[PDB]
């Protein structure tokens, strides 16, 4: 077709597996997916907190992981690896998920900002923010902002140089939308 259009036809396949993985690995806790794509075969190193539900019981998840990628992927030789998440606090996609668990419990907005805003900053970060859109368990729509360090700044620079996580935390009264933005050091 073109060689201009060969960044729109590999990059899409990377999008497709990010959306499906995050959901089906909340049993283990999800954090990222480092996908390294070579013509030889796509080697996906899943970052997950628990290694024992991403390998399965006897290769139960492992068979699911082989069969999934092949539908999506033009590479019919996928290999799988599981690496561990070794700083849950460094990453914004394990603090979106950690904050979501605490909300789903009924642990209020400030009583869960002990462990997702006084622990993330201890780890190292130029800046972190938590934003929590919803109704704040009401009946009308409201948002609240908590801010530390530099992470909003003048221009696109220093606010589109972040690590970014969104989680859904389900309520029986609604949905609450969970944003945690860590900007690592740099």
């Amino acid at each position: 077709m073109a060689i201009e259009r060969y960044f729109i036809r590999e990059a899409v396949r990377e999008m497709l597996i990010d959306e499906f993985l995050e959901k089906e690995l909340r049993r283990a806790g999800y954090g990222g997916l480092d996908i390294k794509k070579t013509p030889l075969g796509t080697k996906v190193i899943i970052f997950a907190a628990n290694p024992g539900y991403v390998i399965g019981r006897g290769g139960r998840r492992i068979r699911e992981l082989t069969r999934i990628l092949e539908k999506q992927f033009g590479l019919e030789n996928p290999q799988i690896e599981v690496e561990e998440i070794k700083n849950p606090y460094l990453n914004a996609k394990v603090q979106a998920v950690r904050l979501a668990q605490a909300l789903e419990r009924g642990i209020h907005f400030r009583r869960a900002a002990y462990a997702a805003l006084r622990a993330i900053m201890n780890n190292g970060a130029r800046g972190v923010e938590i934003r929590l859109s919803g109704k704040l368990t009401g009946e009308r729509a409201k948002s609240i902002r908590f801010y530390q360090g530099y992470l909003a700044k003048v221009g696109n620079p220093a606010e589109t140089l972040v690590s970014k996580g969104y989680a859904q935390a389900l309520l029986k009264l609604g949905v609450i939308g969970v944003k945690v933005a860590i900007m690592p050091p740099g």
């Binding site: 060689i3 201009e4 960044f7 070579t38």
Partner: protein, 102 residues
Amino acid sequence: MQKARIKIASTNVRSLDEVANQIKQIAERTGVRMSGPIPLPTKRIRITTRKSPDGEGSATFDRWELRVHKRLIDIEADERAMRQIMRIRVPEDVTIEIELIS
């Protein structure tokens, strides 16, 4: 020898002469005579979308743009040199196409 045109298209500003002056390294395993990287145009793809789903009133629509930037390198060398280059092409980032003529 065999003439290869290595045509190298890249989405990154600084991965384009960094793999067009350091793909000379990858390439060379036997003697080679090599042409310095010749810039071809940026071929520009626009795709404009409405960010508004409703569209109503006044609105501002996002015009996007991806610029894919081209270098063309010629090399005259053995089969083995060409192979080094098509053996590895990283995650892409860098699309490598090869044209083969004597």
